[PDB]
Design an enzyme around this catalytic site. Structure first.
Site, PDB file in Angstrom:
ATOM      1  N   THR A 754       0.842  -1.198   0.012  1.00  0.00           N
ATOM      2  CA  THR A 754      -0.188   0.052   0.002  1.00  0.00           C
ATOM      3  C   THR A 754       0.712   1.239   0.103  1.00  0.00           C
ATOM      4  OG1 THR A 754      -1.899   1.100   1.029  1.00  0.00           O
ATOM      5  CG2 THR A 754      -0.264   0.328   2.418  1.00  0.00           C
ATOM      6  N   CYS A 755       1.897   1.252   0.714  1.00  0.00           N
ATOM      7  CA  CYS A 755       2.947   2.407   0.474  1.00  0.00           C
ATOM      8  C   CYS A 755       3.632   2.501  -0.902  1.00  0.00           C
ATOM      9  CB  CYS A 755       4.192   2.077   1.571  1.00  0.00           C
ATOM     10  SG  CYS A 755       5.118   3.663   1.742  1.00  0.00           S
ATOM     11  N   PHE A 756       3.701   1.543  -1.631  1.00  0.00           N
ATOM     12  CA  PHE A 756       4.247   1.703  -3.057  1.00  0.00           C
ATOM     13  C   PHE A 756       3.604   0.550  -3.803  1.00  0.00           C
ATOM     14  CE2 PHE A 756       7.281  -2.113  -2.817  1.00  0.00           C
ATOM     15  CZ  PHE A 756       7.232  -2.148  -1.573  1.00  0.00           C
TER      16      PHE A 756
END
EC number: 2.3.2.26
Length: 788
Positions: A754-756
């Site tokens: 979800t971050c990247f």
């Protein structure tokens, strides 16, 4: 006056009185007076004993009935034998007279005891044969009640009298016999035993086995008869073995074979009785703390009746494709009833997964299915309409559905949530609370704080907006739950706040414990979540995709951190996945944002002490989330579990996953499909590489939930931002759940971050492989990316 009474001239007069017929009510008088006949033993007997001799020589037909008319409707006129050449005027009918005497006998001889030449028993045994006696159904309820009484009247006196000839043998009670017991199977199998008569006939035979002493005779004879039942299993089923297996398409076969299983007391119910036999022998006669259970199932498993199942299982689901007339629940449910209720034969408890599902396959019907070994899959093969019927019928849940593990496949949550449309509902004196309506959670510790747990649901929620205990009635939730998006969001206290694992959403936020009232605070989310469930409305604000499982006694999600927080699963690719050789410790203690239980908590058994190995590779990353919501705030989860267990009662338990709860507690997350279509980093998977753009061109194809439950299966923090999801929530909340191809094996799972966000989309094919695997893993909740 008690003691013996008149002998004749009340009986000798009765000779004509025993050839009568009248409307009831006039007959109750007979009940009472003949009850007064007790303490006589001569008016009670003598005539009564021959009255069965008479009936066997009488009612057997109107002629023999007319014969006894001449014999008796006459003897009173002159001497106690015949005379009068009297002819029957229809003053009596066998049915009415028999039933009236029967009810009177039940009313009176029930009190009688200590006396109950087999002639009367021959009438109970031989005359019992008669179609006269085997051509009745209307009274058959009363006949069944009799037969219990006979059993019980005997059972009470069966203690010793049936063998002790002092009292039973007044009319020579044989010490137990089987001819009539065989007669049971030979006759009651007929349609004679109405469904109601069927149940109390089960009770009849139960008594038979029981009475007293009959447990060594009747039960074993009935066991032998049950063995005989397997022989007659295909009395007409064999002809039915393919009658419903032919149909298909617009083929009509009609009701020639409908009335075998559709006709209980002819079949189907036959199998039901077979079940009930050993069931009451085990469930009722024995008890689970005594009941071998497996022996109960061994019967119906070692004594299963395999022959009919594989042979007929193939012949059932043809209705799924057909347009016939008499191959429906009418007959199929009899089978479903049996095939389900049984929970017997070969393997049925084989709950199945989703996986990639290859790419797809057309399971036409329940194809040539075997014996119950392959049954619950048989259900999932008739799924076409079976799943929707279960979504419209819980009667199976109570009936056919007797013992279930795999059913969840066909018995999808959508069926069980339909159950929870009625099971939705599944004393509130007063809860004088204020709750700020923005503070709510923040002041719940001192305002509501579950009012000491489930007391809140056991007390009127006088919670007020500010002082308005009403407005939306007691327990206001319209905005009181919408404002929790501030109170739950809790920018004030550490109880809840943007977290390093989930900046976007607001879950315990580790710290929680640092707040002095965290314990009472978590008692409010112990309830408000189990209370929003056990109350009106749900707070739309999202917590995280790991909070929902923490409500009840369930573990934390580790594969979620692949998406939920890549800093804890993907950046930690040195352990668990990607690269690990059972040596990488990778600082087995995650960031302690908590600061309450700050002992640099070990991420595995020993953390800094023990090496992360095959056993603890999952533990290392999993213990992160465990030290996010189940060890960081475990003592805080103490109240979370208290209220969650307290607030709620058998509420749709284990049907709605976190996504479904996310689709329910937070509502089905919305979407900008137009963006999504021209978003998702649609080209990141190599758009148009026989796939990718196929789902970014035919975009609405999958589903609405498959575009919402997917958003949970790609983020780990829900919090749908729409706008093409380039801000897709997460630790940082970015990336349109990027669809990087990764040129994997064409089926590798979407290890999104979800971050990247990555959402691996390997070289799929033209739909097919793209469909299915992701279309279902997304709809998993805490089973695709969460716990599993």
């Amino acid at each position: 006056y008690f003691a013996p009474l008149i002998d004749r001239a009340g009986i000798a007069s009765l000779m004509k009185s025993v050839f009568i017929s009248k409307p009831y009510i006039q007959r109750e008088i007979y009940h009472e007076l003949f009850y007064r006949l007790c303490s006589s033993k001569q008016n009670r007997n003598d005539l009564m004993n021959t009255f069965l001799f008479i009936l066997s020589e009488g009612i057997i037909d109107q002629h023999s009935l007319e014969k006894v008319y001449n014999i008796i409707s006459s003897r009173a006129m002159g001497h106690a034998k015949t005379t009068t050449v009297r002819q029957l005027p229809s003053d009596c009918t066998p049915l009415t007279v028999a039933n009236q005497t029967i009810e009177i006998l039940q009313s009176l001889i029930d009190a009688d005891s200590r006396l109950k030449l087999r002639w009367p028993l021959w009438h109970l045994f031989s005359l019992l044969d008669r179609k006269l006696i085997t051509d009745e159904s209307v009274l058959m309820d009363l006949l069944t009640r009799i037969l219990q009484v006979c059993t019980k009247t005997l059972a009470v006196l069966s203690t010793s009298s049936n063998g002790k000839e002092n009292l039973s043998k007044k009319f020579h009670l044989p010490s137990f016999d089987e001819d009539d017991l065989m007669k049971i199977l030979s006759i009651i199998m007929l349609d004679s035993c109405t469904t109601r008569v069927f149940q109390q006939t089960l009770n009849i035979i139960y008594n038979l086995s029981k009475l007293q002493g009959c447990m060594s005779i009747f039960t074993k004879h009935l066991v032998s008869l049950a063995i005989s039942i397997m022989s007659k299993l295909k009395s007409a089923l064999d002809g039915l073995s393919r009658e419903v297996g032919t149909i298909t398409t617009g083929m009509e076969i009609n009701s020639e074979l409908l009335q075998k299983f559709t006709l209980p007391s002819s079949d189907q119910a036959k199998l039901l009785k077979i079940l009930t036999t050993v069931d009451f022998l085990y469930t009722h006669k024995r008890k689970e703390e005594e009941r071998n259970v497996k022996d109960l199932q061994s019967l119906y498993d070692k004594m299963n009746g395999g022959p009919v199942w594989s042979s007929l299982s193939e012949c059932l689901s043809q209705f799924e494709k057909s347009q016939a007339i008499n191959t429906s629940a009418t007959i199929l449910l009899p089978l479903i009833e049996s095939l389900m209720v049984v929970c017997r034969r070969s393997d049925l408890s084989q709950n199945r997964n989703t996986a990639v599902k290859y790419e797809d396959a057309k399971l036409l019907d329940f194809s040539k299915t075997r014996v119950e070994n392959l049954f619950f899959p048989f259900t999932d093969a008739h799924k076409k309409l079976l799943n929707q019927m279960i979504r419209s019928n819980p009667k199976l849940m109570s009936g056919p559905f007797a013992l279930l593990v795999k059913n969840p496949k066909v018995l999808d949550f959508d069926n069980k949530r339909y159950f929870f449309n009625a099971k939705l509902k599944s004393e509130r004196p007063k809860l004088p609370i204020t709750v700020r309506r923005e503070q709510v959670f923040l002041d719940s510790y001192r305002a509501l704080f579950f009012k000491t747990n489930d007391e809140i649901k056991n007390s009127k929620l006088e919670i007020t907006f500010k002082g308005e205990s009403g407005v939306d009635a007691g327990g206001v939730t319209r905005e009181w739950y919408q404002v929790l998006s501030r109170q739950m969001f809790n920018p004030d206290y550490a109880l809840f706040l943007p977290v390093p694992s989930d900046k976007t959403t607001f879950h315990p936020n580790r710290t929680s414990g640092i707040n002095p009232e965290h314990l009472s605070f978590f008692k409010f989310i112990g309830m408000i979540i189990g209370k929003a469930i056990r109350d009106q409305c749900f707070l739309d604000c999202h917590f995280s995709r790991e909070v929902y499982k923490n409500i009840l006694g369930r573990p934390v999600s580790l594969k979620d951190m692949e998406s939920l927080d890549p800093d804890y699963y993907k950046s930690l690719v040195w352990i668990l996945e990607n690269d690990i050789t059972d040596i990488i410790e990778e600082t087995f203690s995650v960031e302690t944002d908590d600061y309450g239980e700050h002992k640099v908590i070990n991420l595995i058994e020993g953390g800094k002490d023990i090496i992360v190995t095959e056993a603890n590779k999952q533990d290392y990353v999993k213990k992160v989330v465990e030290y996010k919501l189940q060890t960081s705030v475990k003592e805080q989860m103490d109240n979370f579990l208290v209220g969650f267990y307290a607030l709620i009662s058998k509420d749709l338990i284990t049907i709605f996953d976190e996504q479904e709860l996310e689709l329910l507690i937070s509502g089905l997350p919305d979407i900008d499909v137009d963006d999504w279509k021209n978003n998702t980093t649609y080209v990141n998977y190599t758009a148009t590489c026989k796939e990718v753009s196929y789902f970014w061109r035919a975009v609405r194809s999958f589903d609405a939930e498959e575009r919402a439950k997917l958003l949970q299966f790609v983020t780990g923090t829900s919090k749908v931002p729409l706008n093409g999801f380039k801000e897709l929530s997460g630790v940082n909340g970015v990336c349109k759940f990027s669809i990087h191809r990764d040129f994997g094996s064409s089926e590798r799972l979407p290890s999104s971050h979800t971050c990247f966000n990555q959402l691996n989309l390997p070289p799929y094919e033209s739909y097919e492989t793209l469909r299915g695997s992701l279309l279902l893993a997304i709809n998993e909740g805490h089973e695709g990316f969460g716990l599993a």
